[PDB]
Write a protein that binds this ligand. Structure first.
Ligand SMILES: CCCCCCCCCCCCCCCCCC(=O)OC[C@H](COP(=O)([O-])OCC(O)COP(=O)([O-])OC[C@@H](COC(=O)CCCCCCCCCCCCCCCCC)OC(=O)CCCCCCCCCCCCCCCCC)OC(=O)CCCCCCCCCCCCCCCCC
Ligand code: HEA
Ligand code: HEA
Ligand SMILES: CCCCCCCCCCCCCCCCCC(=O)OC[C@H](COP(=O)([O-])OCC[N+](C)(C)C)OC(=O)CCCCCCCCCCCCCCCCC
Ligand SMILES: CCCCCCCCCCCCCCCCCC(=O)OC[C@H](COP(=O)([O-])OCC[N+](C)(C)C)OC(=O)CCCCCCCCCCCCCCCCC
Ligand SMILES: CCCCCCCCCCCCCCCCCC(=O)OC[C@H](COP(=O)([O-])OCC[N+](C)(C)C)OC(=O)CCCCCCCCCCCCCCCCC
Ligand SMILES: CCCCCCCCCCCCCCCCCC(=O)OC[C@H](COP(=O)(O)OCCN)OC(=O)CCCCCCCCCCCCCCCCC
Ligand SMILES: CCCCCCCCCCCCCCCCCC(=O)OC[C@H](COP(=O)(O)OCCN)OC(=O)CCCCCCCCCCCCCCCCC
Ligand SMILES: CCCCCCCCCCCCCCCCCC(=O)OC[C@H](COP(=O)(O)OCCN)OC(=O)CCCCCCCCCCCCCCCCC
Ligand SMILES: CCCCCCCCCCCCCCCCCC(=O)OC[C@H](COP(=O)(O)OCCN)OC(=O)CCCCCCCCCCCCCCCCC
Ligand SMILES: [Cu+2]
Ligand SMILES: [Cu+2]
Ligand SMILES: [Cu+2]
Ligand SMILES: [Mg+2]
Ligand SMILES: [Zn+2]
Lengths: 60, 196, 151, 51, 58, 59, 46, 88, 91, 161, 495
């Protein structure tokens, strides 16, 4: 019962550790996924990846 | 949907057999590990004496062996099936891997601007259903003629003349790569084959 | 710890410790004695743990510096050497990570986006427009930057 | 702790190890058959609509 | 286990007694006694060792 | 009077007892540590000359 | 199994130790802004 | 560190008591293997205040006339030290 | 007591042979080693010199090898700067 | 008196723990310099003098430790290490032979000259002979080494008996 | 304080104590691991973004090639072997058999300082000097000898780095075998020494037998570069170079892996409070893996042009080597059963990750054994997925088990379990996102050692981007946790 919400003392986990741990790791995964989506939606992209190009070379 | 060759079909079927075997083994071990972990975490089923079982050990050593001889035999036969079509050819083609471009019968092929990395200005043409012999080598350094969708991947090594047998069944353009580090322009040294 | 020289001299074969008044360190190159103090591996940790203390205190500047050097020293030396020898690589990295560099991006265009599921499959992809220019932070893309011509 | 379940060698082998292996064998056979059908589409005729 | 005490392995229930006997030997420099030596010189050496200790043969 | 016998006893009865046999030879230790120093200097100088391209002979 | 040392010089809001911890490891803005969650009950005799 | 030894609050009008003291606390981190924490609530003591509290509980709950003890500010609480067992 | 005694004044042992050397050659292993040495010294060595006596006034008629053809005098235009500084063999 | 320890070799601090690595560093940077500038940084003879001088330490400690610290356990450790070192040398020789016979076991080859019979009187035995190999002088050297081997074996057995 | 400074320097340079040499090996190994990780982050940032976003020029891809080659060399020869074999090998081997020191105390110090010399030469050559070696970690000629981007001397300095590392490894191996064979205390037979010692012995036997061949190959490269011979030229045998190098290549791999098996076995005995299931079986399987690894070297050259019979033979031999590792995996699974391993221990969870990842990597690598199927998977990202889901998820996690088990013992401070949980779990999830996609990008034809890829492969590199961000977070967490390990409190008040 000592320690913080996300950390315990020494080799003693905080109360209800694993649900909190999974939730916080899921939050971190979501944040990093958002960062990747942003860097793909505003980072360097070649002219061959535009909607026109990819939709015209996906037919024949 | 066609296959583009028979050797590729054989390789694909061997791959599928191995995939089935490994997935079965993984499922068995997953069930076992699930039982073990579920018992363990609840502090159940403890026995410090259980550190030996002769029958179980002998059986678990034997079992992987019998299921592995089949895989080995199948793989060997697939290799020889790849290599039988030599000698039944009527066309020869020679391929040279230069520094970041290819040469077919003394005709150069470099990347183009119409395609990003896949297309080439000068393809290599072979006739459908006609067995051909490719004599491959390189001038400066080691490259690797790689068309893995037809089951061809052979290194072009300086001073070493490799000889592969290529056969096409589906008409069209197959894209391949250098598949061997050769320098700065290794990523931009594509291969194009046209089966007509 | 404290020297054992009195015992060594009053020991049983004192002639072996005559060398100890030459240019010679006691701990490293002198004959060990029956009553020597026990030497530990990390003496700082060995002396601090039984008193409840971690070996290094961040409030002391000397200790903070020593621990920084122990943990982050060679890392930052390597980074500094690399940045000094390859200024342009880190310049380009900074340009890319700050959205200053766009290869061939246009204004108002849509670009393909797919997370997984194998290679590009037209039945799974989406198309995305740049939120930065949707908001208004971006109106034109810088051209003074280095451009990988012939690619 | 006091709630830990401690079993002797004979009891553990008989009531834990063997049923585990039995279930593993069942899983092995079932997975083999279902995977072969999943990929090829036929239980004994290799690829479907091809042969 | 401490040097000269009666200890019990309670895994096996066995009573044992460790004991350390030191290897005090004459300095091996060629001045070793070639014939039965008496207690006098040995008495002096043992006294010095028991009071201050003697080097190790490392 | 055997030379080996004399050498042994000298090692035990002839020289100040040193824990380290290399320290039993006072000058050789000085020579060896000087070798270490000059090898460090040689390494540093060679590194500097190779990288910069000026071999320090023109200066 | 920890001796806090001198409670007086470690209870301040800004300290050389805390800044060093932030730079290298062990402390950060999450500790100043949210002490209820990242310091919480803390470790000591009850 | 040096703070007050643990004491006992006692409210007169309500007649209700309770121990108290200063609890040090620090940010949680790894411990030390070779160190069993000393007496921190009652520094430099053999920890007799627990025995004194246990002995004095019957005295206090039974009703103690603590008019000879100092008060705490302007409230109705008085401090009883646990240096020695309380008999009165 | 200590073996040092026999280190200092070792016993002296009487031998029937005129010298210790001969005594050590009554052992089969040393005799066989001497036999090997004699075989090597007698057969090959004496024979080898005999040959240079037998063929003292005759030439070496071995056909010389062919190393470098004329059309390959440039060695394909390959850099040959040895580390010494000049394109010559260390020899 | 002296308190006796276990039978192992206790271990001494020595300057060889870094001098040999510094010697390797010196040799390799010297080679790099010779490759780059085509001129030695210091005289080769001075370098060899330094190398020889550093390595005279081993015999001194060997003598002074055999005089004092030696027993059968230590002798066995030393002899086993010698055996491992000899094994390493044999492996190095095998590797160089591999690098030699690689292009000689593959008999077919492309040759500037002709090696087909019935075109000249000395062409069939061309590819099959490398005549310039100093044959009977190599024979004499082999005789010398046989002398050395047999003499040394005989003397070793003689002293052991 | 001159005396104190010189005393410290003499303590850490003249030493021969196995404990001190072990801690030094561990320190160097961790530092080189961090450096390799930084270079890996550079590589990943190059791959994730499109349009040579970091090098900006096709002519300058030599920087990316240098990155991959130094990443490989740093992470193989200076991260795992110094840590797995150097650190716990020196610190524990004398203790586990009850003896004072290793045999040949001086050769131990010589080994460590040879390693340091190699690291110094490598760091100077590949950073302070221009146009460094850029030929992949397998220095294939004629690319590494007859090229245009590899002409400087620093390339030769890197080859000499390989030489010094080989010397150091040989010395260490000889020392370990000798100490384990004769210094065992009375009553301990050769096959009753605990599992870790035996694995170290077999690893040492592996290193002894193969390193001279690697030395021969590297001397061949140096001679081709310097004296202008033709061993590996258009009139030479680059395939001969490949044969020699890869004859060393696979023994190195099993040398890397086996000590991890030994350490995991030992730690398991320590944390599950039960003996190893079939200890004799595990020891025999370890020696079997060691011996069989000397006959499979050419499964890395199935497309070079080997004879068809040799292709079949090497596929067979690779399957043979696959068997005993499966035996060991089953033995581990049964060992954990019936035990009382700690339910909240980073060591336990790292063991789980090690087991799962090694099984998956072994399977993926058993697919690659078939010669025929190696036609479609040679030099694609399938091989990268394989040897990163083995090296960076089974070897790394075994070393994490050892790290989280031996820190309290060495330093005497317990471990911050919640912190370590964050680190290990984010390392697991991030790494899986980076390497798992590679597998399906290899079956799809993506070649390796390319900074620029076709547009067909975007999804795999997006998932890799995600994984790289998670990896950055995990490694920062790890380093900050360790800094917090040796630092006293920073806050304290009254409640
Ligand atoms: C530049 C960077 C150089 C290397 C790093 C130096 C860090 C320290 C810097 C500093 O200011 O220290 C003051 C500080 C003063 O000490 P102090 O705190 O006042 O205490 C006095 C005594 O030390 C009494 O205290 P003690 O004896 O208890 O020691 C304190 C304890 C404190 O240590 C700890 O608490 C942690 C130690 C961890 C050791 C590894 C354990 C296993 C792994 C665990 C996981 C951690 C991994 C590492 C961190 C990354 C984590 C992600 O241990 C140490 O501090 C030293 C432990 C060994 C590590 C350092 C080894 C340096 C010499 C070897 C150089 C070659 C290898 C490195 C690469 C170069 O120095 C030390 O404590 C270290 C002693 C001196 C070391 C140098 C010896 C000579 C080396 C010569 C060769 C140098 C390299 C080659 C150069 C070639 C030419 C270019
Ligand atoms: C042990 C060896 C090792 C390790 C640890 C790694 C770690 C990583 N590697 Fe790599 N890698 C190789 C061996 C290794 N690698 C080899 C041999 C090659 C081929 C070179 C070539 O092809 O020529 C290669 C090539 C390679 C490529 C090739 C790119 C290309 O060829 O196209 C890429 C790119 O994705 C990559 C990525 C990574 C990443 C993202 C990590 C890591 O970020 C992921 C795991 C990270 C960890 C956190 C480990 C870092 C360790 C520390 C944190 C020390 C802390 C202490 C311990 C826990 C003990 N590696
Ligand atoms: C790091 C350690 C490590 C380990 C343990 C292995 C283990 C194996 N490796 Fe590999 N490998 C590497 C490191 C490792 N490898 C590296 C670094 C490279 C790349 C070098 C490079 O190219 O740069 C590489 C490359 C590599 C290739 C190259 C493919 C190509 O380049 O063409 C091949 C193919 O033959 C291969 C095969 C194997 C096999 C068959 C095993 C087997 O040992 C795996 C055995 C494991 C098991 C089998 C698991 C146990 C399974 C069960 C639980 C029961 C199932 C059993 C049966 C049904 C029989 N490895
Ligand atoms: C019932 C819901 C199913 C699971 C929901 C998520 C997946 C959506 C549907 C999957 C099939 C179509 C593929 C598209 C998306 C696949 C995403 C993926 O992981 O691909 C890798 C891989 C790529 O392989 P694949 O998708 O090519 O699988 C083979 C598919 N066929 C049959 C067509 C050949 O995807 C999978 O393995 C599929 C299952 C994914 C489920 C992941 C659950 C665990 C989560 C771990 C953390 C991941 C963080 C991501 C966070 C994103 C949001 C914040
Ligand atoms: C003096 C040094 C120590 C002793 C050396 C002699 C004993 C060595 C015994 C152990 C084996 C040594 C390593 C292998 C040697 C062969 C080289 C090799 O692998 O060639 C590859 C070649 C194949 O390569 P290849 O022919 O494809 O390539 C040739 C090169 N190109 C392509 C350019 C034409 O041979 C084999 O792989 C065959 C199997 C090995 C055959 C072993 C032959 C050696 C036996 C010698 C017996 C007689 C010795 C006394 C007289
Ligand atoms: C990529 C390939 C890399 C190269 C691989 C090829 C091998 C590289 C070198 C490996 C060396 C392995 C040594 C094995 C053990 C040798 C014997 C040994 O250690 O004996 C015990 C001892 C060392 O151990 P010690 O000094 O700790 O002794 C312990 C105490 N006693 C003696 C009682 C056991 O050796 C010696 O006493 C002499 C060793 C001298 C070695 C170096 C001398 C010359 C240095 C080079 C000169 C210049 C060359 C040009
Ligand atoms: C970057 C470019 C260079 C690169 C070089 C290679 C780098 C890789 C690392 C190589 C190994 C380096 C090892 C450390 C070098 C310094 C060696 C050292 O300090 O040795 C200690 C030794 C102590 O003296 P000693 O006589 O041995 O015994 C104690 C006496 N009181 O010291 C001595 O004996 C000498 C002490 C100094 C004397 C001269 C002072 C002026
Ligand atoms: C987002 C904004 C980030 C910048 C603003 C400042 C953030 C706080 C100060 C930076 C240092 C982090 C705090 C000190 C520390 O030791 O952190 C350890 C931390 C692991 O703890 P963690 O799992 O992040 O707990 C929060 C769960 N959401 O792991 C680390 O420290 C990893 C390296 C720093 C990560 C910074 C990102 C936020 C982490 C929370
Ligand atoms: C102390 C122990 C040894 C220490 C070695 C230190 C150096 C390590 C480098 C290893 C290899 C170096 C190779 C460079 C030497 C080149 C020799 C050369 O030029 O060979 C040609 C010569 C035969 O010339 P040829 O044309 O046949 O003569 C015509 C008429 N007779 O043929 C020869 O001269 C062949 C000589 C033998 C082959 C080399 C194998 C190593 C032996 C060392 C030789 C001297 C090394 C000189 C290096 C200088 C820098 C230190
Ligand atoms: C135990 C240690 C020895 C292990 C030997 C294992 C032998 C496996 C089979 C050898 C073999 O022939 O492999 C094929 C490989 C290349 O075959 P390839 O050249 O295509 O075919 C002949 C073409 N005319 O052939 C080769 O690459 C040649 C291999 C020759 C044997 C070398 C063995 C190692 C020698 C040094 C270490 C010995 C001790 C360890
Ligand atoms: Cu190429
Ligand atoms: Cu290429
Ligand atoms: Cu391999
Ligand atoms: Mg390849
Ligand atoms: Zn017992």
């Amino acid at each position: 019962d000592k320690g913080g919400f996300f950390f315990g003392v020494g080799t003693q986990l905080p109360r209800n550790f694993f649900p909190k741990f999974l939730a916080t790791t899921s939050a971190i995964m979501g944040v990093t996924y958002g960062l990747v989506w942003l860097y793909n939606a505003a980072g360097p992209r070649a002219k061959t990846q535009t909607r026109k190009w990819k939709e015209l070379e996906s037919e024949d | 949907m066609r296959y583009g060759n028979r050797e590729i079909e054989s390789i694909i079927l061997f791959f599928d057999q191995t995939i089935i075997l490994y997935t079965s083994i993984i499922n068995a071990l997953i069930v076992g590990i699930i039982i073990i972990i579920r018992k363990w975490y609840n502090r159940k089923g403890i026995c410090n004496q259980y550190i030996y079982h002769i029958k179980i050990e002998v059986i678990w050593t034997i079992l992987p062996i019998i299921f592995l001889i089949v895989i080995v035999l199948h793989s060997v036969t697939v290799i020889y099936n790849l290599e039988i079509n030599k000698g039944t050819n009527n066309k020869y083609i020679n391929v040279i891997g230069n520094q970041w471009y290819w040469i077919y019968n003394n005709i150069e092929s470099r990347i183009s601007s119409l395609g990003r990395i896949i297309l080439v200005d000068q393809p290599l043409f072979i006739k459908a259903n006609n067995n051909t012999h490719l004599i491959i080598s390189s001038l400066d350094v080691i490259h690797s003629f790689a068309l893995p969708t037809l089951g061809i991947k052979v290194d072009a090594i300086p001073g070493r003349i490799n000889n592969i047998s290529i056969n096409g069944l589906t008409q069209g353009l197959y894209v391949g790569y250098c598949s061997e580090l050769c320098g700065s322009g290794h990523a931009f040294m594509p291969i194009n084959l046209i089966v007509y | 710890h404290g020297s054992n020289l009195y015992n060594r001299v009053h020991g049983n074969l004192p002639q072996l410790y005559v060398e100890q008044l030459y240019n010679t360190d006691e701990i490293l190159d002198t004959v060990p004695h029956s009553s020597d103090p026990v030497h530990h591996m990390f003496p700082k940790c060995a002396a601090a743990s039984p008193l409840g203390f971690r070996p290094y205190d961040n409030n002391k500047l000397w200790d903070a510096f020593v621990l920084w050097a122990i943990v982050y020293g060679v890392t930052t030396i390597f980074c500094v050497l690399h940045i000094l020898k390859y200024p342009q690589i880190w310049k380009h990295l900074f340009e890319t990570l700050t959205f200053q560099y766009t290869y061939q991006r246009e204004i108002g265009e849509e670009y393909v986006w797919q997370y997984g599921g194998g290679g590009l499959n037209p039945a799974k992809w989406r198309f995305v427009k740049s939120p930065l220019e949707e908001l208004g932070l971006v109106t034109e893309y810088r051209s003074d930057l280095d451009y990988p011509d012939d690619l | 702790g006091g709630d830990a379940e401690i079993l002797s060698y004979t009891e553990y082998v008989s009531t834990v190890v063997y049923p585990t292996i039995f279930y593993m064998a069942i899983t092995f056979v079932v997975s083999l058959f279902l995977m072969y059908y999943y990929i090829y589409g036929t239980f004994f005729s290799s690829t479907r609509n091809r042969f | 286990v401490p040097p000269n005490t009666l200890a019990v392995c309670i895994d096996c229930g066995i009573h044992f007694v460790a004991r350390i006997n030191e290897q005090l030997t004459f300095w091996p420099d060629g001045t070793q006694p070639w014939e039965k030596v008496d207690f006098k010189a040995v008495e002096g050496f043992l006294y010095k060792h028991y009071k201050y200790g003697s080097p190790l043969m490392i | 009077k055997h030379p080996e016998w004399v050498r042994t006893m000298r090692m035990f009865h002839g020289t100040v007892w040193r824990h380290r046999p290399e320290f039993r030879h006072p000058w050789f230790s000085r020579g060896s540590r000087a070798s270490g120093i000059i090898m460090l200097v040689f390494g540093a100088v060679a590194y500097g000359e190779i990288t910069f391209g000026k071999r320090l002979g023109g200066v | 199994g920890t001796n806090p040392g001198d409670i007086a010089l470690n209870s301040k809001r800004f300290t050389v130790g805390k800044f060093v911890a932030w730079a290298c490891g062990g402390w950060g803005l999450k500790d100043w802004i949210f002490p209820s969650l990242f310091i919480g009950r803390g470790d000591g005799p009850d | 560190m040096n703070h007050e030894r643990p004491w006992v609050f006692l409210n007169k009008v309500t007649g209700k008591w309770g121990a108290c003291g200063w609890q040090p606390f620090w940010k949680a981190t790894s411990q030390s293997l070779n160190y069993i924490p000393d007496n921190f609530i009652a520094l430099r003591t053999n920890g007799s205040w627990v025995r004194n509290l246990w002995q004095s509980s019957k005295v206090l709950d039974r009703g103690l006339n603590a008019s000879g003890y100092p008060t705490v500010g302007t409230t109705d609480w008085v401090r009883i030290p646990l240096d020695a067992p309380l008999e009165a | 007591m200590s073996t040092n005694k026999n280190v200092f004044f070792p016993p002296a042992l009487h031998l029937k042979e005129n010298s210790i050397f001969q005594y050590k050659f009554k052992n089969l292993a040393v005799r066989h080693d001497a036999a090997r040495l004699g075989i090597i010294l007698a057969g090959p060595t004496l024979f080898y010199w005999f040959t240079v006596y037998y063929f003292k006034g005759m030439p070496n008629g071995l056909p010389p090898v062919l190393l470098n053809p004329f059309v390959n005098r440039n060695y394909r235009g390959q850099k040959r700067d040895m580390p010494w500084g000049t394109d010559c063999a260390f020899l | 008196m002296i308190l006796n320890t276990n039978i192992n070799y206790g271990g001494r601090n020595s300057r060889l723990c870094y001098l040999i690595p510094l010697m390797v560093h010196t040799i390799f940077l010297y080679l790099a310099y010779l490759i780059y500038y085509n001129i030695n940084l210091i005289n080769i003879y001075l370098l060899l003098i330094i190398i020889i001088f550093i390595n005279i330490e081993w015999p001194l400690v060997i003598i002074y430790e055999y005089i004092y610290l030696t027993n059968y356990n230590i002798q066995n450790n030393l002899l086993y290490n010698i055996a491992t070192f000899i094994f390493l040398e044999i492996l190095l020789f095998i590797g160089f032979y591999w690098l030699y016979i690689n292009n000689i076991i593959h008999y077919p080859n492309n040759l500037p000259y002709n090696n087909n019979i019935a075109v000249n009187l000395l062409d069939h035995l061309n590819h099959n002979n490398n005549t310039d190999i100093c044959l009977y002088i190599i024979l004499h050297n082999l005789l010398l080494l046989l002398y050395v081997t047999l003499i040394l074996q005989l003397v070793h057995r003689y002293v052991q008996l | 304080m001159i005396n104190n400074i010189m005393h410290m320097i003499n303590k850490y340079t003249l030493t021969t104590s196995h404990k001190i040499i072990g801690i030094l090996y561990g320190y160097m190994g961790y530092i080189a691991g961090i450096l390799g990780y930084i270079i890996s982050m550079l590589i990943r940032m190059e791959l994730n973004t499109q349009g040579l976003a970091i090098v900006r020029k096709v002519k300058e891809v030599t920087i990316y090639n240098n990155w991959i080659t130094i990443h490989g060399l740093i992470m193989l020869f200076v991260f795992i072997m110094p840590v797995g074999i150097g650190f716990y090998g020196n610190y524990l081997i004398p203790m586990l058999i009850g003896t004072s020191e290793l045999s040949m105390p001086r050769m131990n110090g010589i080994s460590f300082w040879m390693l340091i010399v190699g690291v110094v030469i490598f760091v100077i050559s590949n950073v302070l000097m221009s146009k460094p070696i850029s030929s992949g970690w397998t220095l294939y000629p004629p690319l590494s000898t007859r090229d245009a981007d590899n002409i400087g001397v620093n390339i030769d300095l890197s080859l000499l780095v390989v030489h010094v590392l080989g010397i150091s490894s040989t010395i260490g191996s000889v020392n370990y075998i000798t100490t384990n064979k004769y210094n065992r205390h009375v009553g301990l037979t050769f096959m009753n020494i605990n599992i870790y010692n035996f694995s170290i012995i077999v690893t040492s036997i592996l290193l002894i037998g193969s390193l001279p061949i690697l030395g021969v190959a590297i001397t061949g490269l140096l001679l081709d570069r310097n004296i202008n011979s033709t061993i590996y030229d258009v009139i030479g045998d680059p395939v001969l170079y490949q044969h020699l190098f890869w004859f060393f290549g696979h023994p190195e791999v099993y040398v890397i892996i086996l000590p991890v098996f030994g350490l995991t076995s030992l730690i398991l005995t320590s944390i599950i409070h039960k003996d190893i299931f079939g200890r004799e079986g595990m020891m025999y399987c370890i020696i079997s893996i060691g011996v069989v690894g000397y006959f499979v070297w050419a499964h890395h050259m199935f497309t070079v042009g080997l004879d068809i019979d040799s292709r079949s033979y090497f596929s067979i031999a690779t399957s043979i080597i696959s068997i005993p590792t499966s035996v060991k995996m089953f033995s581990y699974i049964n060992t954990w059963a019936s035990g009382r391993g700690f339910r909240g221990n980073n060591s336990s969870w790292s063991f789980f990750s090690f087991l799962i990842c090694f099984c998956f990597g072994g399977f993926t690598g058993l697919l690659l054994s078939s010669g025929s199927l190696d036609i479609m998977l040679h030099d694609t990202y399938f091989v990268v997925g394989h040897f990163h889901t083995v090296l960076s998820l089974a070897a790394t996690f075994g070393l994490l088990i050892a790290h989280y088990f031996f820190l309290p013992i060495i330093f005497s401070y317990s471990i911050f379990e919640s912190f370590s949980f964050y680190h290990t779990f984010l390392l697991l999830v991030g790494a899986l996102l980076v390497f798992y996609p590679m597998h399906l990008a290899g079956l799809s034809g993506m070649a390796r050692r390319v900074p620029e890829y076709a547009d067909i492969f975007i999804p795999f590199m997006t998932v890799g981007f995600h994984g790289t961000f998670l990896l950055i977070f995990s490694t920062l967490t790890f380093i900050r946790s360790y800094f917090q390990f040796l630092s006293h409190i920073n806050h304290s008040n009254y409640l």
